[PDB]
Design a protein around this ligand. Structure first.
Ligand code: U1H
Ligand code: U1H
Length: 330
């Protein structure tokens, strides 16, 4: 079997992408943030503290005839940006774009951090990293992808994120009409539970390509591109007036500047990120300082190929017994 679902940016800056997911019987449709950087499927629910819900669509297990409480199971997660949530666990039927999994662990939030409450358009997250990172205790739970793997035509899913436009998540098949050229595959390390790979180098604008190994994770759940300080300094040095601002928390640039493209290596292939993708707009309403889409990973401890990089490519997440990542131009 296969599944295919449209994913849509939540705002004009592509800060995140939401994808409709059907949960329960009869179906309750929630718009979830597909996150290859985490491994929990959690949702706003009828159990969430009412003061922490502001416009989100909630999952109501009491209205689903297939929902079963997972006795004694709890979950608690903290994200690298300081976000967090926690609650109890149900199992239920979950469908994504025609692909159905029965007995999927649906983690019901009792408490969410303020950043989720203020994001009215995200009803929850659907984790797509490896199941070793799932936070359910005392019995760890499998991701949607892991539960679907056996029934998929091919044990893959693909991410085709749009720039200021809708995109597609496909499960079980590779749409050979969605990309140009060939797909370049590269090795994945699962030792930390992430889709972790090694980029072969970078170039700024039309400059010389610098061959150098950059270890990082492919993370649809992170907006920006977080790279080592040396790389990020070399990029912003080519933007007149750009500087690192401690008060803002990263590199900013005059909104009137034109940004150079950024190229990253995948084996012998090259993925080019257009300069317009790196513009994240004024730091505050009316400001003439704009926030940059490429920032330093020095404070994070790991390099993150977030949406800024992934939306420049067609990305294959190959969940075979030896997992690999595929990149193609589009
Ligand atoms: N998108 C989930 C996520 C959040 C944080 C991290 C970090 F910062 F720990 F690397 C990885 C993945
Ligand atoms: N990387 C996972 C993640 C995704 C979204 C959010 C936000 F923006 F909703 F708070 C936080 C953390």
């Amino acid at each position: 079997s296969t599944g295919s679902a449209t994913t849509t940016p939540i705002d004009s800056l592509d800060d995140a992408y939401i994808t409709p997911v059907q949960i329960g019987t009869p179906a309750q449709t929630l718009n979830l943030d597909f996150d290859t950087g985490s491994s929990d499927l959690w949702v706003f629910s009828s159990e969430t503290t009412a003061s922490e819900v502001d416009g989100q669509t909630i999952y109501t297990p009491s209205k689903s005839t297939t929902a079963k409480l997972l006795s004694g199971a709890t979950w608690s997660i903290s994200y690298g940006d300081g976000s967090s949530s926690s609650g109890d666990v149900y199992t239920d039927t979950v469908s994504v774009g025609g692909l159905t999994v029965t007995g999927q662990a649906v983690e019901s939030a009792k408490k969410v951090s303020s950043s989720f409450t203020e994001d009215s358009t995200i009803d929850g997250l659907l984790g797509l990293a490896f199941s070793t990172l799932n936070t359910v205790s005392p019995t760890q739970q499998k991701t949607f992808f892991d539960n679907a793997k056996a029934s998929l035509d091919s044990p893959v899913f693909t991410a085709d994120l749009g720039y200021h436009a809708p995109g597609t998540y496909n499960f079980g098949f590779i749409d050979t009409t969605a990309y140009t050229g060939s797909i370049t595959y590269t090795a994945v390390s699962t030792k930390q539970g992430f889709w972790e790979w090694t980029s072969t180098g970078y170039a700024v604008g039309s400059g010389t390509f610098k061959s150098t190994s950059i270890d990082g994770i492919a993370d649809t759940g992170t907006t920006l591109l977080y790279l080592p300080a040396t790389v990020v300094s070399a990029y912003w040095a080519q933007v007149s007036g750009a500087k690192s601002s401690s008060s803002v928390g990263g590199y900013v640039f005059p909104c009137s500047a034109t940004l150079p493209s950024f190229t990253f290596g995948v084996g012998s292939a090259r993925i080019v990120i257009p300069g317009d993708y790196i513009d994240f707009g004024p730091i505050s309403t009316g400001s003439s300082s704009c926030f940059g889409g490429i920032q330093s990973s020095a404070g994070i401890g790991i390099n993150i190929f977030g949406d800024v990089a992934l939306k420049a490519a067609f990305v294959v997440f190959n969940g075979a017994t030896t997992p690999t990542l595929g990149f193609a131009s589009k």
